[PDB]
Amino acid sequence: DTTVRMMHIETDPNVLGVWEEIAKDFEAKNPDIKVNLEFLENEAFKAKLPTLLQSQQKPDLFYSWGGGNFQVRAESGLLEDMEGYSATLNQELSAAGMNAFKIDGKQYGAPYMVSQVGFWYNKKLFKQAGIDGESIQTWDEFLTAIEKLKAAGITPIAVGGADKWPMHFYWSYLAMRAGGQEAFAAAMQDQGDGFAGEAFVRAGEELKRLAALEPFQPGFMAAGYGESAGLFGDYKAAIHLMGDWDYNFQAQQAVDKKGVVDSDLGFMNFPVLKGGAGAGSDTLGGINGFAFAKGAKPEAAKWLEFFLNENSQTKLAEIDQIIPVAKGADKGLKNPFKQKISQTISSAQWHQVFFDQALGADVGGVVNDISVGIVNGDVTPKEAAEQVQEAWEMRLEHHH
Numbered sequence: 001d002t003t004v005r006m007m008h009i010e011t012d013p014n015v016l017g018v019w020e021e022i023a024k025d026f027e028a029k030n031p032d033i034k035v036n037l038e039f040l041e042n043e044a045f046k047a048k049l050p051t052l053l054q055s056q057q058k059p060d061l062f063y064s065w066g067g068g069n070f071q072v073r074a075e076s077g078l079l080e081d082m083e084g085y086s087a088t089l090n091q092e093l094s095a096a097g098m099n100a101f102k103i104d105g106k107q108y109g110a111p112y113m114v115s116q117v118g119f120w121y122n123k124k125l126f127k128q129a130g131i132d133g134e135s136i137q138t139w140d141e142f143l144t145a146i147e148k149l150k151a152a153g154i155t156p157i158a159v160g161g162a163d164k165w166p167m168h169f170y171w172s173y174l175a176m177r178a179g180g181q182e183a184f185a186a187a188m189q190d191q192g193d194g195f196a197g198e199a200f201v202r203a204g205e206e207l208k209r210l211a212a213l214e215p216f217q218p219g220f221m222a223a224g225y226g227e228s229a230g231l232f233g234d235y236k237a238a239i240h241l242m243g244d245w246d247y248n249f250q251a252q253q254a255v256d257k258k259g260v261v262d263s264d265l266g267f268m269n270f271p272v273l274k275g276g277a278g279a280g281s282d283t284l285g286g287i288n289g290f291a292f293a294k295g296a297k298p299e300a301a302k303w304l305e306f307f308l309n310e311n312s313q314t315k316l317a318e319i320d321q322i323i324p325v326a327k328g329a330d331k332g333l334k335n336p337f338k339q340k341i342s343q344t345i346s347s348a349q350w351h352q353v354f355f356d357q358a359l360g361a362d363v364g365g366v367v368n369d370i371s372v373g374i375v376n377g378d379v380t381p382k383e384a385a386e387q388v389q390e391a392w393e394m395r396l397e398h399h400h
C-alpha cells in the first residue's frame, strides 16, 4: 500500500464531505492506494509552502494558483513532470486548464477550478438604500451607490484588509478597466513605463477616490478574509468584492450558517471606467489546481485523474462550490449565480489571473502592500505604481 499526500486550503464542510466521498470511492476501487488530505489555511499555506516544498515533509500534491510562483518552482526543480502519466487527465480536463499547469512541455500539475472575482451584494440592504443593483454599470454609478449606502447608515463594503489581497482586487480591476489587456501585457514585457504607466497610476487614483468615501467597515485593516466574509454573511455590510467561492463561505462564516440567502443576494461584474480601454466582460480570477512536488509518486496521478473526473467535478459544481474544469461537468452548474458566472468566464476575451499570483510572491506582495497603502494614505498612486514597476524589473532580471 502507498499513500498519496495532498495539501489543500479547503475549509467548507460540505466540500470536504464530497472530497471524502470521492476519496472513499477511489480507495475502494484502488485497494493499494490511500489518500491523505492535509489542510493548511490560505495565508498559512502560502507562508509555509516554500519551507515544506524544499524539505522532506513535501507532499505529493499541493494546491496551486499557477502563475509566477509555479513557474519559479518548476525552474528550480521543485516539481515533478508527470507528462508520462497524464493521458487520462488530458482526455477529461479542459485544454486551457491543463496548459495552465504545463511548462516547457512538462506537466507539473492539473487544474481543479476556474473562478471570477466580482461584487457580491445584498439586495435587501440595497433596497433599503434605494439602489437598483442591476443598474450599476460604471464606476461613477458604483461610487454613487456607496454614498447612498452611507446615507442609509449601512456599511457599504466588507474587506479583509489584514490579508491585503482582498484589497488588491480593487487596484487590479481598476488597472484592468483603465488600461485594458494591452496595458497589462506591455507591463509584463517591461515595455514603456511598465507598471508605472498611466493605467496603473489611474488605478491608484480611483482606489484613493473610493477610499476617500470611507466605504469600509471600521477597523478593516485588522480583519482577515474570514472576518470580512462573516460581516457580509451577517448583513453588516452591503458589498463584498470576492471570488465566486465566497457564495458558500459567507454562509459558513455567518452566525446563522446561512448568510445572505438567495432571495437577498446579488452578483455584479466589476463596472467599466469612463475613458478606460478595458471591457466590462474582462474578468479577474484564476485557474487553480494541484501541482506535483518533486518526487511525486505515480499513484498521485492515479488519484488526481479520479478526483478531477467528470463525476467528481459535477458533484462539486452541484454543491455550488466550483466552476469545474472537467469536460461535461458544467451540467452540474444548476445554481443561478454560478451558472451566470461560468458564462461570464467562458465569454471573456481577457481572463486575467490575480495580479498577486501572476507576478509571484515578491512583486505580488508589493501589489498587495500598495493596495492597502493607497487606501491608508501611506503611498501616493504614483509612488505605488513606481514600486510595482521597480520590483517587477528586478524579478525579470533575476529569473530565466
Ligand SMILES: O[C@@H]1[C@@H](O)[C@H](O[C@@H]2CO[C@H](O)[C@H](O)[C@H]2O)OC[C@H]1O
Residues within 6 Å of the ligand: 009, 042, 165, 245, 288, 354, 355, 356, 357
Ligand atoms: O493570493 C490570493 C489567494 O490567497 C486567494 O485564494 C483564495 C482564498 O479564498 C479561498 O480560500 C479560495 O479557495 C482561495 O483560492 O485567491 C486570490 C489571490 O489573490
